[PDB]
Amino acid sequence: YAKEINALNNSLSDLDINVSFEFFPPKNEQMETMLWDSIHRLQTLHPKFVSVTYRTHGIVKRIKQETGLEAAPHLTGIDASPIVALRGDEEKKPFYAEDLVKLLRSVFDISVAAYPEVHPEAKSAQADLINLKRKIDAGANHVITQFFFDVERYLRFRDRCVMLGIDVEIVPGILPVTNFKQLGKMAQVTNVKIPSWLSQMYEGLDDDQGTRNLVAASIAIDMVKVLSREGVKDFHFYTLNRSELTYAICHILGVRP
Amino acid sequence: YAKEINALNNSLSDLDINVSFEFFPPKNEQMETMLWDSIHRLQTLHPKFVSVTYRTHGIVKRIKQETGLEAAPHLTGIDASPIVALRGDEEKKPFYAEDLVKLLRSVFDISVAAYPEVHPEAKSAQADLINLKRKIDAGANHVITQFFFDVERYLRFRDRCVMLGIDVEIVPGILPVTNFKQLGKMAQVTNVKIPSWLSQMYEGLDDDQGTRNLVAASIAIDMVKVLSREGVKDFHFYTLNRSELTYAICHILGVRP
Amino acid sequence: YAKEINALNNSLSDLKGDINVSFEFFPPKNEETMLWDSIHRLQTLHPKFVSVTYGDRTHGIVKRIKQETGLEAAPHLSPDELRQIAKDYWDSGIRRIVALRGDEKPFYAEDLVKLLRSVADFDISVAAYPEVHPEAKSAQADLINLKRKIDAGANHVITQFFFDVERYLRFRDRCVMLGIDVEIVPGILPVTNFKQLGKMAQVTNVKIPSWLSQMYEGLDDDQGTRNLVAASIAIDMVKVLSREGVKDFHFYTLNRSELTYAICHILGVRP
Amino acid sequence: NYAKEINALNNSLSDLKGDINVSFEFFPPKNEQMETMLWDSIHRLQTLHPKFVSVTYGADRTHGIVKRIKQETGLEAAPHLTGIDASPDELRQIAKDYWDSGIRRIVALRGDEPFYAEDLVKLLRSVADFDISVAAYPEVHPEAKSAQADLINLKRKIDAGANHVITQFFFDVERYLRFRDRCVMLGIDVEIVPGILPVTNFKQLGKMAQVTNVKIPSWLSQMYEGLDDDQGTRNLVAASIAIDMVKVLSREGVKDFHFYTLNRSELTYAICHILGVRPHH
Amino acid sequence: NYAKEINALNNSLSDLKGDINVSFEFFPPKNEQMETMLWDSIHRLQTLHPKFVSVTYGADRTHGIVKRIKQETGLEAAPHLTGIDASPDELRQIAKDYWDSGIRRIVALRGDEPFYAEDLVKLLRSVADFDISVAAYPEVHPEAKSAQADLINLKRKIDAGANHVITQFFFDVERYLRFRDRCVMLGIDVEIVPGILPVTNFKQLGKMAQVTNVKIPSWLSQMYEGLDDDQGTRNLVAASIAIDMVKVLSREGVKDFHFYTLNRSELTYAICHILGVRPHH
Amino acid sequence: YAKEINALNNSLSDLKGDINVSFEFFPPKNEETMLWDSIHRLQTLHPKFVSVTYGDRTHGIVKRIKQETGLEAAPHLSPDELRQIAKDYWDSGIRRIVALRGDEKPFYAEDLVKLLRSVADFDISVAAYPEVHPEAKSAQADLINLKRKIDAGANHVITQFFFDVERYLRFRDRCVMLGIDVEIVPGILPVTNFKQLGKMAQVTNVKIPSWLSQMYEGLDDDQGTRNLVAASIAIDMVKVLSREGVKDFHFYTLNRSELTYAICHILGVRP
Ligand SMILES: Cc1cc2nc3c(=O)[nH]c(=O)nc-3n(C[C@H](O)[C@H](O)[C@H](O)COP(=O)(O)OP(=O)(O)OC[C@H]3O[C@@H](n4cnc5c(N)ncnc54)[C@H](O)[C@@H]3O)c2cc1C
Ligand SMILES: Cc1cc2nc3c(=O)[nH]c(=O)nc-3n(C[C@H](O)[C@H](O)[C@H](O)COP(=O)(O)OP(=O)(O)OC[C@H]3O[C@@H](n4cnc5c(N)ncnc54)[C@H](O)[C@@H]3O)c2cc1C
Ligand SMILES: Cc1cc2nc3c(=O)[nH]c(=O)nc-3n(C[C@H](O)[C@H](O)[C@H](O)COP(=O)(O)OP(=O)(O)OC[C@H]3O[C@@H](n4cnc5c(N)ncnc54)[C@H](O)[C@@H]3O)c2cc1C
Ligand SMILES: Cc1cc2nc3c(=O)[nH]c(=O)nc-3n(C[C@H](O)[C@H](O)[C@H](O)COP(=O)(O)OP(=O)(O)OC[C@H]3O[C@@H](n4cnc5c(N)ncnc54)[C@H](O)[C@@H]3O)c2cc1C
Ligand SMILES: Cc1cc2nc3c(=O)[nH]c(=O)nc-3n(C[C@H](O)[C@H](O)[C@H](O)COP(=O)(O)OP(=O)(O)OC[C@H]3O[C@@H](n4cnc5c(N)ncnc54)[C@H](O)[C@@H]3O)c2cc1C
Ligand SMILES: Cc1cc2nc3c(=O)[nH]c(=O)nc-3n(C[C@H](O)[C@H](O)[C@H](O)COP(=O)(O)OP(=O)(O)OC[C@H]3O[C@@H](n4cnc5c(N)ncnc54)[C@H](O)[C@@H]3O)c2cc1C
């Protein structure tokens, strides 16, 4: 094991990496104060793009103008009719994200969502993979995964994508665990299995964010180190409008100002 | 590699661990303010003992009384004549740490220093290992290593100790890298090889301690995870009178209040 | 290698309860004692459905299960004669039928899916052959035939039993490469009688691995040890299959319940 | 690539034959219904021609069973010898009494006290030329001064005359392999024979592991919860767990196995069959 | 346990024989002193009876050399074919001209442009039934849309008729093994033949690796700094680096090797000798 | 296995400049050309010392090196006759002598260390045999004899050449277990002539590994490839030895300089 970790470390200095940050429209102004403080410091990393959770039309323009980074908004299909194209979390009369990419393309660089542990509403794992292919075959050119913690399940899913012919990279979505109680709620609606070892690390830390920040680094740094070794040069961080972790992770990948 | 990190994580929840902290006599009162704030929070971990760098006679008593934790002072042989027994960093007329253990035993639980990468003044690696055996054969019962970053070199040194007959555990000394410039100066006087990958991680971080705290966690957490897997149940932290890292590391080992 | 099994074992608590199972029985020849006893022990597992092979009248077995057990039952299967059989099955409460060509002017499973769909909105299960059906002209033809079976109205794929998990995983990959949007449910046959398996495998063209034959030589009279060896093999297969994304399983119980019950328990399938 | 790894793990079993030594361990039957189970298990397991069988010793039921085993089956039977019960003079008499009855192997142990085994091994060797099997603890004995000291103690027990090593049962195979690699580093020329305990009972295992300091993995508990009344399923689960271990162990070059039968034969017989240890081989 | 691992790595070389295929790569000699070095290298390497030798093509010197090789040595010589220089009509004529001269293998490549190879492979197959060797990039080609796309492109080149794959040279063996494992996942039935470039010159290597996007490890630079004037020591260092790779590669089941000789024979001859490819075997 | 070499390679930049080397030559038989050429190429490496074997008068070789090169030189070696030889060596500027018993009323190296210490405060190098000197009654006796050699006044241990690194590392471990406080410096012999080695190894009882013989079969006329194969072997040994703590090396140059120079360069030993 000592040889494995040392091997992981010396192969990371042999790095050309693209990053992309994700923020969410704040609830209060204290959250909007914490966001722009994080938005100002993150701009120094020169990311490939940023994203806006889904109202949020006044963020893709503001970020594009108050700053100089390329912004892209999320867009669902809830309550509308005939560029992160999502179906959304629904109600009557649904259409699938593919229909949105087909529609939006008529008007762009489309980003779709991928689920290595299968979307909860998918009829099967085979159907959920075919749906991602036709989403790209509809006009998308950037694939972003839902957050995960079994890196193996990601690598097998990534291997099945090239097997189907998907020629675009399956960008892993990195979620640093800065609030475990929040993750549990997020995981309830995302059907992503939380490993047993991750929960054991965070019991008794519901009030010490500083230690949570330190423990979250080790988990996210380990994942990114393993992902980088296998050829992954694209990353998309779910910052949760915080910047301490996403900044430190990117620094390990050589992403520095 | 994904299987290796996941294997490292599930085997850590299968833990009975002893810890020991080390502090140094402050230079100013701002440092003494930061020390006792760290001394108050660290006491909750119930460590096996604490140590005091080498004046420092008014710390083993104060810590023992103002708090409830067992304190042990460092003691060199510089400028004296006929319980962390050290020879010290010298001048004329030297005696070796063994002579101190032989003397002090006449008056205790003695802790000696071990060097997996060999003490710089040792005639050879074989001599430096024999000297550690006779130090224990003189009456010591606790071995603490100088800080290291090649965990393999520690494991081979630990394997050579039982080969010589040393029946006491070789407690690894964990130094979380919270100030890389300080480490470089410490490493100049300690002859400990700093791995090339560690220096690459910390370039450009001479003013961002927060990211240094996050990166220091991943390195120290990785080491401790590998050390724990091989049977190590004893740890000695060089806190440098800081508590953010040592607290977070111990928490990963189950050491919690 | 030591880390591989430990990794395979820790993947079962990261599965919660997402595994679907389906049991298969056959109409008995003599006094039926092991058949009805095994349905009682399995009924607690809440399977997606159970099935009964068709070779006499096996409607009086699908009927008892439908009421005596409360489990969804599905029976295996001239065009006009089948129209009444399918209509009689539907009006009895049967919602699923496993449409198969059979062994004995042929009527192929594709035509049957076309027929059953005309009778009612059935949930049809078709057979897939990862080691190729012995009569297929090629592996590509047998893969196309499975596509046409699903495109005719089928919505459930069950595999012939196998023991080379590699050959299954490659086959399952060729199905999604061809566009098959349904999961290829593996058919698990726990080896409780190697002599039966050797004869069964000779007529189905399924390869018996050399390591499997060595495990069972000299056990033609020790049923207890075969059950114990069958546990290791079936749990091993199910462990790797589950880790690689298979969450549906179809057990060929052969009217025995000890192995399927223990296998399901490893997958979290419990009462 | 698990499906390929499991297939090569099974092909390796057919890449070995005739070199697998096995040994079985029984305990003195308390009642008389257990007497029937033990001698049924002995008759089933004796067809495997093991290297020896051993009988545990609590606090002279053991000595009579070892005698009955050698006279009714011809197997080399080895009693376990506790030094905590008697004095160095009584132990020399027992050692002479054991040797004159045809006993050529003793499992020399310190004992479960509610004087160490290196002294007992030194004593036995002084009396006669037995083969002496000693205990190893890959997860470290619960009362050792340190993990370093417990490894030296085993080294001293070998230096004192012991020629056979049997480990406490384990369930993390990697920590056995780490332990065996450390024993080869110290120069212990004998092989560290892994003790295999088929988990036929989880509530009883929880008691043994409680006393023995052996770590029960999280996945093993999740496999047995709810099976406290189903012996048939517990055996099928145990057969998977034990066969997996011995397949992995046999891959890394382990050709010697010790089985904690708990007077039961069905599991040990099946595991030996997987290893190629069969009546006709 | 490195001393034991290095010993088993060397014992494995003596656990293989007669199955190792090797192929050598030369480039058109610019001057006339290089002409002597190439034909000296050819005469030394031809005794190894390689599967074929190949000649690179810059922007018809290549075609004449392939002709001289086949007529003076009898080796199957394979020219490299660039699609960036000519049009689809000229390429069909060259393909017919190549085939009528006895050429049965072409290294079909897109080319170094200051139209892709799948189209060139499709073209060649339409003309005649050559064996077509295509390029693989375990560290990904510098101009691919993604690592996913470069792997599909190689898959399409195989589907188009190519029956041989040669990799860009590498120095992290693990990333070649990862790449080969991914090619087996996609079902590419041919083996990914690793291209071995003995580092006889570090300044020249820095130029190739610069163009090729191949990552030069930190340890490899520390081995050559200061040797910019000592060819004798550079060869001894290169022999260690290349032999280590092919020993590791031969352990993982690689039985095919391609060598970037740079018209030099001393290194390739020694590496082949380690692999058991010798004049008398 | 791929990770093992990569780990071995990254351990050379974590070594900085802590390696000590020592070269060994022998008085030539004919026209001496390769001998003096090799001393010039090696002199830039700043070795701890060089040595010259003794079989004629080899003082006129230790003398030239002492002045023409500026390197610390050490010569190999009746009791009264040796007293003047040791006294003549000391007053010439020689501070180190490699005291050996020799091959041809014996005088053992132990007695020589006792003698040389009586002459002056010499730095004595003794020979160690990890595969046991062929005439030792046992491995324990040959290990005790090395202890008595050091306890008589020696302060430097040099090993006979070897190729089983395991047997060396175990031997080096038995030395410290016996109390030997000095490092057991491995003697590295790069195999530039296998035919010489096979004959050399027959009279010294050092085992030639089977893989080494296979690497050199058919190379009795190709010196260039032997040099290339010798590089791989010698660098491989030196790589693992350095990683496991050996920082002193003694090369048997055999009056050749290509291999030792390249080996030293891998260890950071550079001008
Ligand atoms: C990176 C990322 C960012 C996100 N941002 C937001 C955000 O800002 N706001 C928010 O509310 N949510 C957000 N989500 C959540 C996301 O909207 C949910 O995952 C949603 O329920 C599915 O979105 P989708 O675009 O992947 O849907 P789709 O791609 O349409 O997939 C959803 C399901 O539709 C099924 N499907 C598709 N076509 C068919 C068909 N013809 N027949 C049957 N089934 C079909 C597929 O099987 C699949 O299971 C985000 C998710 C990710 C990964
Ligand atoms: C955990 C830890 C805490 C420390 N705390 C402090 C502190 O508070 N203050 C401080 O100033 N320094 C401290 N140090 C540094 C320490 O004092 C230095 O490493 C010192 O130079 C050696 O100490 P020692 O006790 O290991 O010396 P020793 O154990 O005596 O070893 C020093 C050297 O003496 C040699 N030696 C021993 N006997 C003989 C002999 N008979 N002949 C020849 N050589 C011999 C050995 O080979 C060895 O190389 C600490 C070090 C550690 C690891
Ligand atoms: C899970 C399972 C359950 C089974 N249950 C039963 C049962 O209850 N009773 C029973 O008797 N048997 C049963 N069988 C066996 C099976 O039904 C027969 O043995 C038969 O050989 C295969 O059935 P099928 O429906 O898949 O045939 P099909 O897939 O319809 O046909 C088999 C062959 O015909 C070929 N084919 C298909 N269409 C054409 C065409 N147009 N032209 C030419 N060739 C064509 C296919 O390539 C294939 O090789 C079962 C098999 C499985 C796997
Ligand atoms: C295969 C096997 C069979 C067993 N059979 C029996 C049986 O029949 N009856 C029974 O009652 N129990 C039995 N036991 C239980 C066993 O005796 C207990 O584990 C006991 O507590 C230790 O026995 P030991 O011989 O291994 O002790 P030892 O290995 O001799 O030592 C016991 C402990 O003391 C430590 N120690 C050794 N020397 C010293 C010293 N000088 N100073 C301080 N500490 C020291 C050791 O490190 C170890 O932790 C068995 C155990 C095993 C694994
Ligand atoms: C063994 C070997 C021998 C060589 N010999 C020569 C030689 O003789 N002469 C010479 O000039 N060069 C030579 N080269 C250099 C080589 O031609 C260059 O690397 C070239 O840039 C790529 O060649 P290729 O055939 O691999 O291209 P391809 O693999 O066909 O493709 C080139 C790039 O374009 C991408 N691509 C493929 N299809 C598409 C598409 N539809 N849309 C967009 N991008 C696409 C691929 O992913 C790849 O990144 C050689 C290289 C190797 C490894
Ligand atoms: C690095 C090196 C350099 C060498 N250089 C030379 C050289 O320049 N010239 C040359 O001629 N040879 C040389 N030799 C060879 C060596 O000197 C002889 O071949 C001799 O056989 C071994 O020498 P030694 O000093 O180690 O002998 P010793 O170690 O003194 O004796 C060899 C044997 O005697 C046994 N022995 C020692 N003391 C006693 C005792 N009291 N009673 C019984 N047995 C005893 C030992 O156990 C051992 O088996 C060299 C060898 C080495 C390894």
Side-chain angles (χ1 to χ4, degrees), chain E residues 25 55-56 58-59 80-82 107-113 116-118 135-137 141-144 146 149-151 153-154 156-157 166-169 258 260:
Chain E
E25 182 175 300
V55 184
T56 63
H80 294 210
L81 191 50
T82 298
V107 188
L109 308 131
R110 174 223 159 77
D112 278 317
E113 46 102 57
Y116 298 98
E118 186 199 3
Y137 304 90
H141 178 274
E143 294 166 0
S146 65
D150 199 8
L151 186 61
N153 174 35
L154 174 62
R156 296 220 215 95
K157 290 192 285 191
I166 297 177
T167 83
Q168 183 75 279
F169 60 92
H258 182 69
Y260 301 117

Side-chain angles (χ1 to χ4, degrees), chain E residues 3 7 10-11 44 172 174 219 223 227 230 235-236 240 244 247 266 269 273 278 280, chain F residues 5-6 9 41 166 211 214-215 217 219 222 225 227-228 231 235-236 239-240 258 265 270:
Chain E
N7 196 258
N10 292 339
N11 285 322
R44 182 113 156 95
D172 190 4
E174 296 199 42
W219 56 264
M223 289 172 79
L227 302 180
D230 189 358
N235 294 339
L236 299 174
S240 171
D244 271 353
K247 284 192 296 190
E266 303 87 35
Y269 189 87
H273 177 87
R278 300 161 192 180
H280 62 299
Chain F
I5 295 292
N6 272 297
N9 289 343
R41 173 152 188 72
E166 282 188 315
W211 60 263
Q214 184 270 355
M215 285 179 165
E217 67 95 7
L219 293 175
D222 187 3
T225 303
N227 290 347
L228 279 194
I235 297 183
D236 270 354
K239 272 157 162 181
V240 47
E258 309 93 51
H265 173 85
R270 296 157 193 187

Side-chain angles (χ1 to χ4, degrees), chain A residues 8 148-149 151 172-178 197-198 201-202 212-228 235-238 245-253, chain B residues 5 9 214-215 217-218 221-222 225:
Chain A
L8 270 175
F148 58 87
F149 304 96
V151 185
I174 306 305
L175 174 60
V177 277
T178 54
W197 55 262
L198 194 144
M201 284 179 164
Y202 280 74
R212 288 200 299 193
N213 290 348
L214 272 57
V215 178
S218 181
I219 294 165
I221 299 299
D222 271 353
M223 300 179 54
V224 167
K225 273 151 53 187
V226 168
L227 286 176
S228 169
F235 291 85
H236 181 30
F237 298 79
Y238 303 100
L245 260 303
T246 302
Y247 187 83
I249 303 162
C250 291
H251 171 86
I252 299 307
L253 295 111
Chain B
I5 297 293
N9 287 342
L214 272 57
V215 178
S218 181
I221 299 299
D222 271 353
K225 273 151 53 187

Side-chain angles (χ1 to χ4, degrees), chain F residues 2 4-15 17-28 30-31 36 38-39 41-42 45 47-53 55-56 58 60-62 65 68 70-76 78-80 85-86 89-94 96-100 102 106-109 111 113-115 117-136 138-147 150-166 168-194 196-198 200-201 203-242 244-255 257-271:
Chain F
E4 308 275 76
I5 295 292
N6 272 297
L8 272 177
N9 289 343
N10 288 119
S11 73
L12 273 34
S13 57
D14 188 78
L15 177 158
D18 312 315
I19 296 290
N20 297 331
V21 300
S22 60
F23 304 159
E24 179 168 307
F25 318 91
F26 55 85
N30 308 276
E31 291 299 315
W36 286 106
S38 308
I39 291 177
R41 173 152 188 72
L42 293 176
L45 291 174
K48 170 176 302 303
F49 71 93
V50 305
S51 61
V52 188
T53 64
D56 60 310
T58 84
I61 291 178
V62 190
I65 304 171
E68 270 158 4
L71 288 175
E72 235 263 284
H76 295 212
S78 60
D80 306 293
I85 284 183
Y89 272 139
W90 171 267
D91 280 301
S92 168
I94 276 73
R96 162 173 273 114
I97 295 181
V98 188
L100 303 167
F107 191 94
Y108 291 83
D111 306 306
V113 184
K114 294 182 180 302
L115 189 152
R117 291 304 280 169
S118 73
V119 180
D121 183 52
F122 277 120
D123 282 340
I124 315 190
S125 296
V126 289
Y129 304 85
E131 309 187 26
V132 179
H133 188 266
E135 286 166 356
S138 60
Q140 198 70 39
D142 196 61
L143 189 59
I144 295 310
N145 177 54
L146 180 69
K147 181 67 172 170
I150 288 164
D151 285 358
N155 58 347
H156 199 249
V157 183
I158 302 183
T159 69
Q160 178 70 291
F161 65 85
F162 61 94
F163 305 97
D164 190 359
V165 186
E166 282 188 315
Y168 162 87
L169 291 177
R170 276 190 293 266
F171 184 77
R172 170 176 183 256
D173 286 0
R174 290 187 245 104
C175 291
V176 64
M177 291 181 83
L178 209 82
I180 291 164
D181 54 85
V182 187
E183 164 67 84
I184 315 300
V185 182
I188 306 304
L189 175 60
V191 185
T192 55
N193 181 14
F194 179 87
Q196 219 189 13
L197 171 71
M200 271 183 287
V203 304
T204 46
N205 203 46
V206 47
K207 167 168 186 52
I208 297 305
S210 55
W211 60 263
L212 193 142
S213 293
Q214 184 270 355
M215 285 179 165
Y216 280 91
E217 67 95 7
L219 293 175
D220 309 302
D221 293 294
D222 187 3
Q223 172 81 53
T225 303
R226 289 201 301 264
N227 290 347
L228 279 194
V229 176
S232 65
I233 294 166
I235 297 183
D236 270 354
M237 299 181 54
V238 167
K239 272 157 162 181
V240 47
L241 287 176
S242 82
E244 302 222 359
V246 172
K247 303 197 176 307
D248 286 68
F249 292 95
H250 184 64
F251 300 96
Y252 302 101
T253 62
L254 302 177
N255 300 9
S257 60
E258 309 93 51
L259 261 304
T260 301
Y261 195 102
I263 302 161
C264 291
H265 173 85
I266 300 307
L267 292 160
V269 182
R270 296 157 193 187

Side-chain angles (χ1 to χ4, degrees), chain E residues 89-95 97-100:
Chain E
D89 277 312
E90 311 161 44
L91 299 169
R92 297 198 206 90
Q93 188 58 35
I94 299 172
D97 293 314
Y98 278 173
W99 177 271
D100 285 296

